């Protein structure tokens, strides 16, 4: 595992707000990076950069980005409670979806259904193909929904909040969680499903929790609870190595690679000078981009 990233991209004006999900790597190998009020696209193949959009009103900022599975549309959540849908090949906003009462800090796609999480605590399902996009409201959080992730098989949706809860929702309704994990003693932003085990979920808590928890969402069992000694902003699973990677803050501002299922520490990726905000994985699974409050995106080819 290389101790240095393969690339370092400048991320000037990246919002140092823990609850936002400002980066996402598309299946088309394009990294979407939200920098204050703009979204930049960076093609990992050509290095071409495109300023896709800029918010039009003063005080507006991007609070989340998420690529649809095919990588041709980008969802962008805003501080003005909008969930915009951008066609990145046309470089045009197809939709400006309103329904939320507060910023949309988290997003996750399940086919044509886009789920959005808000600072209000609500999650909305949006059928982006239809006029009345708002087809469901999932209300299981009383504070900001900062983690939102559909399972790769679409059978469950996980959400983590600033109310220290993890909810595991069904894919259809009523709309009540199948599981509500209260064991994290801090905000739950890190939420990632095991790619090779349908019901296995990894979650990570903030500064007052510092733990990575592995769950079986069917039995509700906590399979593992590991102290990372720092806030856990993000978790990713490598489908190739059978490992997890987590991003952290004070004091080391590092990424940790853990062996699964033993949860043994494999490596620490040091380099960021301020807290890591988000991790995102390349489509091939080889590279992890970490966005940090030090205004850089470090691209670690740690799984190749």
């Amino acid at each position: 595992i290389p101790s240095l990233p393969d690339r370092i991209l400048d991320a000037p004006e990246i919002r140092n707000d823990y609850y936002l999900n400002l980066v996402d790597w598309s299946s088309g190998n394009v990294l979407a990076v939200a920098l204050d009020n703009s979204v930049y696209l960076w093609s990992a193949s050509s290095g071409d950069i495109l300023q896709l959009l800029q918010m039009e009103q003063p005080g507006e900022y991007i609070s989340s980005v998420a690529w649809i599975k095919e990588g041709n549309y980008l969802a962008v959540g805003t501080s003005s409670a909008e969930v915009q849908l951008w066609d990145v090949q046309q470089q045009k906003r197809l939709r400006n979806m309103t329904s939320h009462s507060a910023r949309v800090g988290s997003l996750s796609w399940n086919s044509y259904i886009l789920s959005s999480g808000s600072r209000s605590g609500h999650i909305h399902h949006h059928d982006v193909r239809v006029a009345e996009h708002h087809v469901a409201t999932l209300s299981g959080h009383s504070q900001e929904v900062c983690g939102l992730r559909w399972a790769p098989d679409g059978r469950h949706l996980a959400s983590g909040g600033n109310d220290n809860l993890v909810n595991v929702w069904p894919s259809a309704p009523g709309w009540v969680p199948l599981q509500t994990f209260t064991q994290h003693q801090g905000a739950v932003k890190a939420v990632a499903w095991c790619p090779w085990q349908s019901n296995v979920l990894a979650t990570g808590g903030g500064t007052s929790d510092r733990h990575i928890r592995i769950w079986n969402v069917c039995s509700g069992a906590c399979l593992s609870a590991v102290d990372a000694h720092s806030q856990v902003c993000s978790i990713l699973w490598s489908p190739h190595y059978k490992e997890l990677i987590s991003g952290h803050g004070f004091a080391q501002n590092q990424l940790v690679i853990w062996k699964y299922p033993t949860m043994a520490k494999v490596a620490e990726l040091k380099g960021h000078t301020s807290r890591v905000l988000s991790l995102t994985m390349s489509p091939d699974g080889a590279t992890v981009a970490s966005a940090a409050a030090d205004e850089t995106l470090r691209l670690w080819r740690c799984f190749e």
């Binding site: 991209l9 400048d10 991320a11 000037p12 004006e13 990076v33 920098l35 703009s38 930049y40 960076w42 950069i49 300023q51 995106l297």
Partner: peptide, 4 residues
């Protein structure tokens, strides 16, 4: 330069 953003992302440079």
């Amino acid at each position: 330069a953003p992302x440079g």
